[PDB]
Every structure is written in C-alpha cells, then in structure tokens.
Design a protein around this ligand. Structure first.
Ligand code: HEA
Ligand code: HEA
Ligand SMILES: CCCCCCCCCCO[C@@H]1O[C@H](CO)[C@@H](O[C@H]2O[C@H](CO)[C@@H](O)[C@H](O)[C@H]2O)[C@H](O)[C@H]1O
Ligand SMILES: CCCCCCCCCCO[C@@H]1O[C@H](CO)[C@@H](O[C@H]2O[C@H](CO)[C@@H](O)[C@H](O)[C@H]2O)[C@H](O)[C@H]1O
Ligand SMILES: CCCCCCCCCCO[C@@H]1O[C@H](CO)[C@@H](O[C@H]2O[C@H](CO)[C@@H](O)[C@H](O)[C@H]2O)[C@H](O)[C@H]1O
Ligand SMILES: CCCCCCCCCCO[C@@H]1O[C@H](CO)[C@@H](O[C@H]2O[C@H](CO)[C@@H](O)[C@H](O)[C@H]2O)[C@H](O)[C@H]1O
Ligand SMILES: CCCCCCCCCCO[C@@H]1O[C@H](CO)[C@@H](O[C@H]2O[C@H](CO)[C@@H](O)[C@H](O)[C@H]2O)[C@H](O)[C@H]1O
Ligand SMILES: CCCCCCCCCCCCC
Ligand SMILES: CCCCCCCCCCCCC
Ligand SMILES: CCCCCCCCCCCCC
Ligand SMILES: CCCCCCCCCCCCC
Ligand SMILES: CCCCCCCCCCCCC
Ligand SMILES: CCCCCCCCCCCCC
Ligand SMILES: [Ca+2]
Ligand SMILES: [Cu+2]
Ligand SMILES: [Cu+2]
Ligand SMILES: [Cu+2]
Ligand SMILES: [Mg+2]
Ligand SMILES: [O-]
Lengths: 535, 256
C-alpha cells in the first residue's frame, strides 16, 4: 500500500525511480509543449504580462489560449523560467533517475547474481533525496524569483553573475534541489560500486559480467568524481548570493568564467552519465533480438571505460567563446575529437552483432535500431561543434539544441523506451501489446525527427538559444518543429496509455524467459516477476 | 545600403558571408558536412541492409562470431584518419580567427541589460544602441504601428523587427576592425553571423575579436548569452560603408 516507499529492496527502489522519472518526464515534456506553442509563430501570443494580474490558477488557464500581439505584452521572464525548469528537470530529475536509479537498481544486482545492494537502507534514502530534490525544483517555480515575478530564469547551468544577482529566493531553492539530486546520485553510486565489487555470485568473474552491469559500474565512478565538483560550484553561487563572498563578482576580484570551468567539469561527465546505461541496454537488446552474442565483448567494456575517462578532460568545449586562449581552444578541440573513436567502436560492434544474425523486429529492437541511427546523427553533430572555429558560429544557437536533443531525446530516451519494452514483462508479470509498442515507436520516430532536425536549419540561419521570440524569417522551421513536438507529445500520451493498459490488463506473462535463449542473463533465469528475495 | 547579414525565410544554410573568416567557416563546415553525411548514410545503409538480409524469415540460423580482426583494425584506424584530416584543415582556420591582427579601426563594445554601448577610442565617439521597439524607443518589445513607422524612418522595414537598432555600429569596407568586448552587469555575447564572429561580453574581462568586411551593407546579430528578461531584445546592427561615408559619419559626431 504505502510501504512501497519504505522498502529497501533493490527491485522496489528501481520501480519507484522508474515511475517517478516517468512522471517528472511528463511534467518536463508538458513544459516543452507550451514552449513550442510560443515558438510555433513569431510574435508573442501566449506568454503575456497581462496574465500576471489574474489568479495563479486563472492566469495559468489564460496563458494556454493565444492572444493578439496588440493585447500581449511579452513576458520574457516566463520563457526563461520554463526553459530553465525543462532543463533542470531533465538533467537532474528524469533521465538519470530512470536509467541509473531505475534500471540500474532493478537489474544490476540481478545481472551479477547479488541478492540486494550492499546498503539497502542507503538505497531507500537515495530515492527520498531524489524526491526531495524534485519537490524543491518544482517549488522554485512558485517562489519569488527574478524581475519581481516567480521562478528563476537563469538557464539550467546557472551562470553568474546572472544567477547570483537574480532577485528572490527561487534560485536558492533551485541550488538546494540540485544538491539533493547530487546526494541521491552519490549514494546510488556508492551502492553500485560496493555491490559490483563485493557481491558478485561465485564464478561471476569481472570478464563474465553483463555489459549493462558494466555500464552502471562505469557510470557510478563518473558520478563520484563529477557530482562533488558540482556541489562546490553551486555552493559558491549560494555564498555569493547570501553570505557575502565574491568568487564570481569582478568588484571583489572574482571571475565569472571560473564558475564555468567548475560547472563544466561536472557538466560534460553529466552527459556520459546519462548515455552509458543506455549503451548497456542497447547491448542486451540487440544481442537478444539479433539472436547472436554481442560482438567484441571486451572492446565494448573498454570503450565504455575510455568514453568515461575522456569525458573528464574535454569540458571547455562548452567555453570556446568565453575567453579561452587559442592554446586551450586547440587542446580541448583535439581531446574532444578522440571520443568519436571508442564511440565508433561501439556503433560498429552493434551493427556487427546484427550481421549474420536472425533478426526479430519486435518493439525493443525498433528502439535499439532507432538509437543507432539517431545517436549517430547527434554524435556527428557533436563532432562539428568540437571544432572551435565552426562553434564560433553555432555556439548558443539552435544547432547546439539540435545536437543535444538528438543524443538525449532520440538517443538516451530511445534507450529508456528499449528498456521499458524489453523488461516490462519481467518486472510486472504482464506483457505489452505488440502492435501498440510499434505504433508508439513510429509516432515518436516521425515526431521527434520533425521536432529537432529543422533546428539544425534554425541554427545555421543564426537563431539564438533561450529566446521567447524571433525574427520573422525563422518562422517556417519553427512551425515545423512545433508540429513535430505536438505529434511527439501525442506519442507520449499514447505510451502512458500503453503502460496503463499493460499493468492493468496486459497478457499474463507465463515464462521465465519470454524472449529467446539469446537473452542469456540471470533475470531470464528467474520468474516474472522475480521472487521478493532472489539469490 | 543592401541588407545582407540576416536570416531569410525557410533558410537551411548559413547567412551570407561578408568576411574572409566567415568564408572559411562556410568551407570548413561544408567539408565536414560532406564527411558526416557520408558516415551517417554509411551507418544507416548498413543497418537497413542487415535488417533486410538477416531478418529472421530470410536467415533462420544465426551465426555466432564475435571477432573479425581485419575489420576491427580498419574501423579504428579509418575514424582516426578521418579526424586527423579534419584537424589539419580546422586548426589553421582556428588560428586565423583567433590571432588578432593590427587594427585599422578599434571599437570597444559593452553589453548591458539590455542594450549595447559602443566606443571608438581613436575618435572619442560613444553611444548606446537599443532595439527599435524596446522601452528606450517607446515600445514594449513587440510589433506595433509605431514600431513599424520607426523601422521605416531608420531605413528598414517591418521584416527587420527584432534585428534593427536605433543606432548602428558603422565601419569602412576592406579595413581591419578590432572589437574589444566586455559586460557591464551580467554576461552577454556579441556576434555577427555574416562576419563569422562571436565573443562573450564578460563583466571584468576585455576580450578581442576581429573582422574585415568585404562588401558594404547592413549586418545583424543578436545577444548570445542568456542575460535576463530582455535577452531576446538587445540586437546588433553593423553598417559597412565606403571609406568616405565612414569619415562623413565620424564628422557628424565631431563636437566643435
Ligand atoms: C547524452 C547526452 C550527450 C552526449 C552523449 C553528447 C556527446 C557529445 N557531445 Fe554534446 N551536448 C549535450 C549532450 C550530449 N552530448 C548537451 C546537453 C549539450 C549542451 C549543454 C548546454 O549548453 O546546455 C551539449 C553540447 C555540446 C558541445 C558545445 C556546443 C556549444 O555550446 O557551442 C559540444 C562541443 O564540442 C559537444 C560535443 C559532443 C561530442 C563530440 C560528443 C561525442 O560523445 C559524440 C560521439 C559519437 C559519434 C561521433 C557518433 C558515432 C561514431 C561513429 C559512427 C564513428 C565515426 C565518426 C567519426 C569519424 C566522426 N556537445
Ligand atoms: C533528457 C533531456 C531532454 C529531453 C528528453 C528534452 C525533450 C524536449 N525538449 Fe529539451 N532541452 C533539454 C533537455 C531535454 N529536452 C535541455 C538541457 C535544454 C536546455 C535548457 C537551457 O537552455 O537552459 C533544453 C532546451 C530545449 C529547447 C530550447 C529552449 C530555448 O533555447 O529557449 C527546446 C525548444 O524547442 C526544447 C524542446 C524539447 C522538446 C519538444 C522535447 C520533447 O517534447 C521531445 C519529445 C520526447 C518525448 C515526448 C519523450 C520524452 C521521454 C522521456 C523524457 C523519458 C521519461 C521517463 C520514463 C518514461 C521512465 N528543449
Ligand atoms: C512511466 C513509467 C513506466 C514504468 C514501467 C515499469 C513498470 C513495472 C512495474 C511492476 O510493478 C510490479 O507489480 C507487480 C504486480 O503486477 C508486483 O507484485 C505484487 O503483486 C503480486 C500479485 O500480482 C504479488 O504476488 C506480489 O507479492 C506483489 O509484490 C511487483 O512486486 C512490482 O514490482
Ligand atoms: C492521444 C494519442 C492519440 C493516438 C491514438 C492512436 C490510435 C490507435 C489506433 C487504434 O486502432 C487499433 O489498431 C490495431 C492495429 O491494427 C488493432 O489491433 C489489431 O491488429 C493487430 C495486427 O497488427 C493485432 O495484433 C491485434 O490483436 C488486433 O487487435 C486494434 O484493435 C485497433 O483498435
Ligand atoms: C490517451 C490514452 C491512449 C490509449 C491507448 C491504449 C493502447 C492499448 C491498446 C491495447 O489494445 C488491445 O490489444 C490486444 C492485443 O493485441 C487486443 O486483443 C485482441 O487480440 C488478441 C491476440 O490475438 C486476442 O486474443 C484478443 O481476444 C483480442 O481482443 C485488444 O482487443 C486491444 O484492445
Ligand atoms: C566498419 C563498418 C562496420 C560494419 C559492420 C558489419 C560487419 C560485417 C562483417 C563481418 O564479417 C564476417 O565476419 C565473420 C567473423 O570474422 C566471418 O566468419 C569467418 O570466421 C568465423 C570465426 O570463427 C568462422 O566461423 C566462419 O566460418 C568464417 O567465415 C565472415 O566470413 C564474415 O563475413
Ligand atoms: O594564421 C595562422 O598563422 C599561424 C602561425 O602563427 C599558422 O599556425 C600554424 O603554425 C603554428 C606554429 O607556431 C602551429 O603551432 C599551428 O598548429 C599551425 O596551425 C597557420 O598556418 C596560419 O593559418
Ligand atoms: C484563434 C483561435 C485558435 C484556437 C487556438 C487553440 C489552442 C489550444 C491549445 C490548448 C492545448 C493545451 C496544451
Ligand atoms: C517484421 C516486418 C515488419 C516491418 C518492419 C519495418 C522495417 C523496420 C526498419 C527498422 C529500422 C528502424 C530505424
Ligand atoms: C528540405 C528538407 C526537409 C527536411 C524535413 C525534416 C525531417
Ligand atoms: C496565430 C495564432 C496561432 C496559434 C494557434 C494555436 C495552436 C496551438 C495547438 C497546441 C497543440 C497542443 C497539443
Ligand atoms: C548528418 C547530420 C547533419 C545535420 C546537419 C544538417 C544541415 C543541412 C543543411 C544543408 C544546407 C547547406 C547550404
Ligand atoms: C593535426 C590535427 C590533429 C587532429 C586531432 C584528431 C585526433 C583524434 C583521434
Ligand atoms: Ca509566438
Ligand atoms: Cu560536453
Ligand atoms: Cu544580453
Ligand atoms: Cu542576452
Ligand atoms: Mg554561451
Ligand atoms: O556535454
């Protein structure tokens, strides 16, 4: 009933992370729908200052209906708040909780034959810190913030002096949210590493561990280095705002650019923390539905280790226009390019896995194959951006937006969906209906490409990031992008419907392994769902 | 003057180049685009072929291989070579961009919430530059009859709303302009797509960029670091004019 939340079992914690990540994801996606309503056409029609003089509730409902421009005073602060909320929720409160907190907690112990995490009580606390962080993030949207309004309009990376001069305490609430997220992540990482190292089953040697378990292990190490650095960066923002320090304020001999070095030291590793567990899921899924063992097991592990390590020495590719010396720029450009090599090894090995196989195009496999194509499109755009000389033009334009949505919303998220369809039978004892899984895939596939591919054009034409409104010439591709986002949203609501149907009246799962023998890890050896106590 | 540096309806390419640096960006990005279009077409065709060829109906018994040394070597070395190639063309372009030459004209630019301040230290000229339609010009950041009229009066049209400012940075063609950029309050970013330039305006730091405009005209940029409520409403207008018209503009500003 209500002891779902006081449970210390890795399977229950994993389910709670998945559901919660899903719900926050819905909230953050709803924000992007409203964003794309405003970007659908030039001129501001929705985010009108006039809506501020109503109730909180009435104002909300009025802001969902378009006004004529002559009746709509543009409210840039609300745009900035929405965007900041969207980003913070995704990067801290959705995708890592789903992959790492969710599938990680559920499946890693199963994959290594551990009965539970090393410290189950710590694991339960991990979850509550995530919920507390989320609540603070959400509350920040309703707290006194910038420009005498509610909410922080400062961007998900909180650059000073903008972030340190924003009025109200909304920004302080956001900083505390992020601290709580980091704490949740660190506790999780402690558990994953200890469990992985100590609690493997007899015979389960380091080079017998499934790739998903490896992806979680490597990810956990990245969290231990990256998240403490972030805790430092944002604490310094907090003291600049409230306790008289001057770390980032030039009047006291501070330097705003220093914040950027510290923040991006976390900020790059953050994206590899997002995508590594998705690499792990893709390996399991492609092996299963190709009916063929994963190609190059050892290079797959070492490629993940290499990506992880390299992800710590590239941060200033986020700072090419911020005053970096030509030497710094040249170094970070070359260091970044190297990442394409181990990543390329993983993409080719996934294709090599399919080669000579017996391919079954079930829903999980569709997500995996979409991932290969779409993550490649995003990764290759990331290589464009590593070239400082071209980044001169693209930096803080929609080309960057297109990059990161291809790798995240058409990459990591495709990994999340692959995992859901792959494992829902195993976790619930009910099977999803196949035709609906495929329909979800195609609607999302068409919609997300329509949303983001045109943003490459917008960036090339010079459309800046974080703008409520834009010159009339950007109209066409913004319109197409918005229609794509509306279709993607329809696909997500349909997905939630598919999940609801599955858990409520989906076909009863009868087999331990309802896939095939090439799903050869320990979870497929157990009942569906597994016993409360396994191993 | 011709309006050259601006987005065009339905555009999918870069803004027109009006500098040798912007020309270099177009070439380098063009070269890399061909490469990455090839990589992704390649990858995509391999996927679709493998799904067609090895579909469970057509290949009933799966192979079990997990190694292929020649191919594994090839698919490591080729990416390495592709990247070294890109590096070899990209680093010169980078060096050209970031090595600041000797200035014919020096402009110091300051970012403010939410407008730009310009100073010409050789000429003892300074002025501020606000979006036409901002509160400074009587507006509230949206189109209106009054805003359209002001755009007309300044030599623009309603199509340039959100790009055109009340005053412009004017410079002579075919001269080396060095711009020194800083921020007064928060970080802003100064940019002109047609020139292939962008540099953050950071409080407490003075950073430099250069361009040499190769044709006369009007070229727009927009502030490129989120800086608060009117981030979307503090753009950049550069007018590139003849050497004689530039001197005329200078004399117009001279106080006797
Ligand atoms: C999952 C999340 C994720 C991932 C995995 C990546 C992966 C990569 N990222 Fe991305 N990125 C983001 C999320 C992500 N990024 C976000 C959120 C931002 C914006 C932050 C902000 O400002 O808000 C950003 C911004 C960003 C920038 C800054 C742009 C700017 O602000 O101006 C840069 C610059 O170098 C960059 C580069 C790269 C590169 C080179 C990779 C590489 O890892 C890609 C490697 C993959 C491939 C290259 C494809 C597969 C390889 C092959 C098929 C082999 C053959 C290929 C070649 C020879 C090229 N990213
Ligand atoms: C995981 C990361 C993620 C994801 C999934 C998305 C999803 C989307 N984003 Fe996101 N976006 C960011 C991260 C992400 N975004 C970040 C970090 C920024 C920068 C913020 C800043 O500037 O400070 C940004 C900025 C940003 C902008 C630019 C704002 C600006 O510059 O002013 C836009 C514009 O259209 C946009 C649109 C969208 C849309 C339409 C979607 C979606 O509607 C696309 C469709 C996808 C779906 C419908 C499915 C989503 C599924 C999940 C999220 C999984 C949920 C979990 C479970 C099911 C377990 N985003
Ligand atoms: C948008 C988010 C998407 C998330 C999708 C993933 C959903 C997975 C949820 C599965 O939840 C499971 O539900 C079972 C019920 O179906 C539970 O068994 C429970 O119910 C059984 C009866 O059916 C009993 O025998 C068990 O003791 C009792 O634990 C089981 O423990 C629980 O983990
Ligand atoms: C807010 C978002 C809005 C999105 C709305 C999405 C609309 C969904 C279309 C409904 O039509 C369905 O099509 C299925 C596929 O054709 C049918 O399955 C039928 O056909 C399948 C054959 O592929 C079989 O597997 C099934 O058993 C059989 O029920 C199903 O009955 C039918 O209702
Ligand atoms: C915004 C909310 C969006 C809501 C979208 C929800 C989508 C979920 C639809 C599930 O569709 C079900 O699929 C089953 C599996 O295909 C069908 O079983 C049908 O097919 C089976 C398999 O052949 C038969 O055994 C059954 O008797 C026959 O009813 C069933 O009819 C159909 O309703
Ligand atoms: C860079 C782009 C990435 C593209 C990805 C596509 C990869 C496809 C190439 C794989 O080629 C196959 O590899 C097998 C393993 O090397 C060979 O089997 C050979 O070696 C096996 C290993 O024992 C034997 O079982 C076989 O009989 C013998 O034919 C087989 O001939 C060859 O066609
Ligand atoms: O302008 C640039 O001037 C540089 C000379 O300062 C050259 O840089 C070249 O020469 C340098 C010698 O200091 C090397 O360090 C650089 O990597 C190499 O690109 C480069 O060709 C040229 O376009
Ligand atoms: C001029 C009348 C056009 C009607 C616009 C309808 C907009 C509906 C948006 C509501 C959807 C909420 C996400
Ligand atoms: C099993 C036959 C159903 C038809 C499948 C359509 C082709 C799927 C292509 C997969 C590539 C996804 C990017
Ligand atoms: C002119 C090419 C159109 C591309 C459509 C986006 C998918
Ligand atoms: C010129 C006014 C255009 C506004 C049209 C409103 C369309 C909103 C559709 C929202 C779709 C939400 C799913
Ligand atoms: C392989 C993915 C790269 C996506 C970039 C698309 C840009 C295409 C625009 C071409 C216009 C050239 C003038
Ligand atoms: C002289 C250009 C060097 C290019 C660096 C790429 C190396 C990554 C592998
Ligand atoms: Ca609009
Ligand atoms: Cu990065
Ligand atoms: Cu600004
Ligand atoms: Cu700005
Ligand atoms: Mg920037
Ligand atoms: O990144």
């Amino acid at each position: 009933f209500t002891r779902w939340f006081m449970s210390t079992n890795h399977k229950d914690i994993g389910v709670l992370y998945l559901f919660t990540g899903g719900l926050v994801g819905l909230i953050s996606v709803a924000f992007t729908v409203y964003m794309r309503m405003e970007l659908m056409a030039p001129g501001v029609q929705f985010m009108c200052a006039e809506h501020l003089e109503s109730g909180l509730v009435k104002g909300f409902f009025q802001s969902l209906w378009p006004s004529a421009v002559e009746n709509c005073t543009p409210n840039g602060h609300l745009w900035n708040v929405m965007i900041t909320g969207h980003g913070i929720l995704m990067m801290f409160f959705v995708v890592i909780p789903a992959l790492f907190g969710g599938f990680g907690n559920y499946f890693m112990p199963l994959h290594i034959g551990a009965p539970d995490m090393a410290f189950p009580r710590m694991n339960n606390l991990s979850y509550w810190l995530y919920v507390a962080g989320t609540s603070l993030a959400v509350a920040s949207l309703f707290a006194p913030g910038g420009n005498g309004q509610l909410g922080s309009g400062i961007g998900w990376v909180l650059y000073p002096p903008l972030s340190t001069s924003e009025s109200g305490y909304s920004t302080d609430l956001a900083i505390f949210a992020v601290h709580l997220s980091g704490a949740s992540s660190i506790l999780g990482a402690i558990n994953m590493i200890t469990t992985f190292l100590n609690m493997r089953a007899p015979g389960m040697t380091m080079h017998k561990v499934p790739l998903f378990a490896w992806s979680i292990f490597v990810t956990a190490w990245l969290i231990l280095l990256a998240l403490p650095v972030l805790a430092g960066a944002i604490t310094m923002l907090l003291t600049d705002r409230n306790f008289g320090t001057t770390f980032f304020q030039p009047s006291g001999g501070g330097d705003p650019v220093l914040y950027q070095h510290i923040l991006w030291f976390f900020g790059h590793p953050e994206v590899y923390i997002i995508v590594l567990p998705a690499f792990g899921i893709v390996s399991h899924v492609i092996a299963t539905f190709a009916k063929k063992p994963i190609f190059g097991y050892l290079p797959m592990v070492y490629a993940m280790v290499a990506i992880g390590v390299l992800g710590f020495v590239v941060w200033a590719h986020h700072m090419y226009t911020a005053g970096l010396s030509l030497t710094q720029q040249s170094y970070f450009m070359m260091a970044t390019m190297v990442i394409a090599v181990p990543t390329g090894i993983k993409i080719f090995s996934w294709i090599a896995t399919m080669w000579g196989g017996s391919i079954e195009l079930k829903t999980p496999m569709l997500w995996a194959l979409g991932f290969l194509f779409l993550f490649t499109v995003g990764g290759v755009t990331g290589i464009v951006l590593s070239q400082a000389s071209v980044d001169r033009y693209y930096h803080d334009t929609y080309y960057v937006v297109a990059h990161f949505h291809y790798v995240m919303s058409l990459g990591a998220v495709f990994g999340i969906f692959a995992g859901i369809y792959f494992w829902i039978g195993k976790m619930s004892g009910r099977q999803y209906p196949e035709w609906a899984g495929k329909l979800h895939f195609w609607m999302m596939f068409v919609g997300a490409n329509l949303t983001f591919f045109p943003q490459h054009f917008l960036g090339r034409q010079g459309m800046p990031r974080r703008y409520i409104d834009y010159p009339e010439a950007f109209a066409t591709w913004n319109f197409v992008s918005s229609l794509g986002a509306f279709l993607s949203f329809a696909s997500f609501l349909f997905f939630l419907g598919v999940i609801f149907y599955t858990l409520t009246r989906g076909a009863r799962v009868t087999a331990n392994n309802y896939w095939n023998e090439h799903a050869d890890t320990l979870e497929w050896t157990l009942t569906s769902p597994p016993p409360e106590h396994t191993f | 003057l011709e309006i050259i540096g601006r987005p065009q309806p339905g555009g999918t390419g870069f803004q027109p180049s009006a500098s040798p640096v912007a020309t270099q960006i177009h070439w380098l990005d063009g070269f890399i685009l061909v490469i990455i279009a090839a990589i992704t077409i390649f990858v995509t065709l391999l996927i679709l072929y493998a799904v067609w060829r090895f579909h469970e109906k057509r290949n009933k018994v799966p192979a079990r291989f997990t190694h292929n040394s020649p191919l594994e070597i090839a698919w490591t070395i080729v990416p390495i070579v592709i990247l070294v190639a890109i590096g070899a063309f990209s680093l010169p372009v980078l060096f050209n961009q970031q090595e600041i030459p000797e200035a014919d004209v020096t402009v110091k630019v300051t970012g403010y919430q939410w407008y730009w301040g310009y100073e010409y230290p050789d000429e003892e000229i300074s002025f501020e530059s606000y979006m036409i339609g901002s509160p400074a010009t009587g507006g509230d950041n949206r189109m209106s009859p009054e805003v359209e009229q002001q755009l007309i009066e300044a030599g623009y049209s309603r199509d340039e709303f959100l790009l055109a400012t009340d005053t412009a940075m004017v410079v002579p063609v075919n001269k080396t302009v060095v711009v020194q950029v800083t921020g007064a309050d928060v970080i802003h970013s100064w940019t002109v797509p047609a020139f292939g330039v962008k540099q953050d305006a950071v409080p407490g730091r003075l950073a430099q960029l250069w361009f040499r405009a190769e044709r006369e005209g009007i070229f727009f940029g927009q502030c490129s670091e989120l800086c608060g409520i009117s981030h979307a409403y503090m753009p950049i207008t550069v007018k590139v004019v003849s050497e004689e018209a530039y001197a005329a503009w200078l004399e117009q500003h001279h106080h006797h």
